[PDB]
Design an enzyme around this catalytic site. Structure first.
Site, PDB file in Angstrom:
ATOM      1  N   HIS A  50     -48.834  -0.224  19.473  1.00 23.20           N
ATOM      2  CA  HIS A  50     -47.617  -1.020  19.638  1.00 23.20           C
ATOM      3  C   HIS A  50     -47.826  -2.286  20.461  1.00 23.20           C
ATOM      4  O   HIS A  50     -46.873  -3.059  20.622  1.00 23.20           O
ATOM      5  CB  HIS A  50     -46.437  -0.183  20.143  1.00 23.20           C
ATOM      6  CG  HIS A  50     -46.498   0.181  21.597  1.00 23.20           C
ATOM      7  ND1 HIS A  50     -46.828   1.447  22.032  1.00 23.20           N
ATOM      8  CD2 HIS A  50     -46.213  -0.535  22.710  1.00 23.20           C
ATOM      9  CE1 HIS A  50     -46.761   1.490  23.351  1.00 23.20           C
ATOM     10  NE2 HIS A  50     -46.400   0.298  23.788  1.00 23.20           N
ATOM     11  N   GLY A  92     -45.266  -1.258  31.472  1.00 22.25           N
ATOM     12  CA  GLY A  92     -46.649  -1.679  31.550  1.00 22.25           C
ATOM     13  C   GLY A  92     -47.655  -0.555  31.680  1.00 22.25           C
ATOM     14  O   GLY A  92     -48.862  -0.831  31.713  1.00 22.25           O
ATOM     15  N   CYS A  95     -48.350   1.805  29.467  1.00 20.24           N
ATOM     16  CA  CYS A  95     -48.903   2.323  28.224  1.00 20.24           C
ATOM     17  C   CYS A  95     -50.402   2.074  28.148  1.00 20.24           C
ATOM     18  O   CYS A  95     -50.917   1.064  28.638  1.00 20.24           O
ATOM     19  CB  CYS A  95     -48.191   1.699  27.024  1.00 20.24           C
ATOM     20  SG  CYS A  95     -46.567   2.412  26.804  1.00 20.24           S
TER      21      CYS A  95
END
EC number: 3.4.19.12
Lengths: 298, 299
Positions: free
Chosen positions: A39, A141, A143
């Site tokens: 993503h 932030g 991920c």
């Protein structure tokens, strides 16, 4: 008795930052490949319903900015495996540890290295819960932060972080990019299945409380395995298998408390409660210590 | 909220083992000095009441086996500073991070890298109790394991492990070798002072509750610091210091709730109890998250 994470240094030396447009997250740099959540290729408008194969075909290698500290790593290739992007870079990570990718089972624990902008921020222990969520501590932030276990200098990576659910729990994938649980990497509110309690872990924690000196919860009552499991299911506790009983063997021998006798103590706790009392300082039954986690401290 | 340790890699790269005879503990290798507990020089018979000055006279540089893994580090000088031994070695540690030696106050938290034979086994967060003890997981061979905080890539080392007390809690020194609390490095049963609740951390917990929208316990009262402290002591809560009021500053500014107003809310909770209500989903007040810990986990 407290939760203990594995030393994180071998993983810290693998964390990098990956940026696409105005989307930035963390990647895992092993040899000449950086792994990260796919993503990253999305914009704000893309995240609501992303067609990842279409979004990816429109990307070039130069659209990916990978930074290891202040050094930029040149992306020389890219592919997608399930929900993970694999970016081939032109330089190998000399800090790559001996590693494996593993898919962990519900009820097992792992250490999380929470990272922001490719910089490690904290380390803590989590369990893969029976409904395939984790009770993590992840902010914007985070991920691409990973979960892992360490066995004789070999890092077994088992989790990569992707999303938060409305209840405050978290969801992610293994390092092959397959989600744990029925979740999808789209920007929607997703509910999990029923959050059942990891019975074998609760039993291990009660044994830890006994080793520590607490035993107000013990009793002389007895139970069969089947009768215990009927009560466990009634209280949304996972079934206890014979394998679990076997796994609890060492803790049972050390304390002289038969597994089924500890099951009878837990049954009373479920039926009567703790009555304001605490176990190992906790007002609630703790289920994120495995039998192995207990032995490693006891 | 959960206990979250700092990433341990910068400290892992400084851990070594130090052996005298058959006694091995851990040491901390920074630049060309290895720091470790001085009781590495004791035999079992020396540990009841060691004359450390006399025992150190019988030691030469070549008596110390310092190893990073299986690789020996040659010792070229030795000295004692309070309860720590400093072994000068012939090699500067290339993994030395930016660092400081800090002496922490009760209630402050830090990460412990538990080590055995110079090999790290696990990392966890500890709180220094008001009686200057910590609740760690420390087994045989853990001495010389260190506690630390990390701020902007600088490691502030604050604890080195020396001993266990009869109640199962643990005691140690700063990196200058000065014990926290009234403890000495001998093989004797030593009692800690009666422990108390870390008031400043409970207040930090209440601020965290407010930040997350759980604020039923806020009242329309205020108090003086002295009035609160006199009440707090009756409930086995630690009296607040001026430094405590100061470290609550950021959370007070974030919520708009003056520190002394929050003290009045806490005083009401002490005098009236919870009455079946919960704060952050708990009937028990947590005292092991500092104001800094709360800010970290909120952002």
């Amino acid at each position: 008795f407290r939760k203990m994470a594995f030393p994180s240094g071998k993983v810290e030396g693998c964390m990098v930052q990956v940026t696409c447009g105005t989307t930035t997250l963390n990647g895992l740099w092993l040899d000449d490949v950086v792994y990260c959540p796919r993503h990253v290729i999305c914009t704000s408008e893309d995240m609501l319903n992303p067609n990842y194969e279409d979004l990816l075909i429109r990307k070039s290698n130069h659209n990916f900015l990978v930074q290891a500290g202040n050094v930029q790593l040149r992306v020389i290739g890219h592919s997608m495996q399930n929900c993970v992007l694999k970016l081939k870079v032109d330089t190998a990570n000399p800090k790559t540890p001996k590693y494996k990718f593993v898919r962990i089972q519900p009820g097992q624990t792992f250490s999380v290295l929470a990272c922001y902008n490719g910089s490690p921020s904290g380390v803590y222990q989590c369990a893969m819960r029976p409904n395939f969520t984790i009770k993590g501590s992840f902010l914007n932030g985070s991920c691409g932060s990973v979960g892992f276990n360490i066995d004789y200098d070999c890092v077994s990576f088992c989790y990569m972080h992707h999303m938060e659910l409305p209840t405050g729990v978290h969801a992610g994938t293994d390092l092959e990019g397959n989600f744990y649980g029925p979740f999808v990497d789209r920007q929607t509110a997703q509910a999990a299945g029923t959050d059942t309690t990891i019975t074998v872990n609760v039993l291990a924690w009660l044994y830890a409380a006994v080793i520590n000196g607490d035993r107000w919860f013990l009793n002389r009552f007895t139970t069969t395995l089947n009768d215990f499991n009927l009560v466990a299911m009634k209280y949304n506790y996972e079934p206890l298998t014979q394998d679990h009983v076997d796994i609890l063997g060492p803790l049972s021998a050390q304390t002289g408390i038969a597994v089924l006798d500890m099951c009878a103590s837990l049954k009373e706790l479920l039926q009567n409660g703790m009555n304001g009392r605490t176990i190992l300082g906790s007002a609630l039954l703790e289920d994120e210590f495995t039998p192995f986690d207990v032995v490693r401290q006891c």
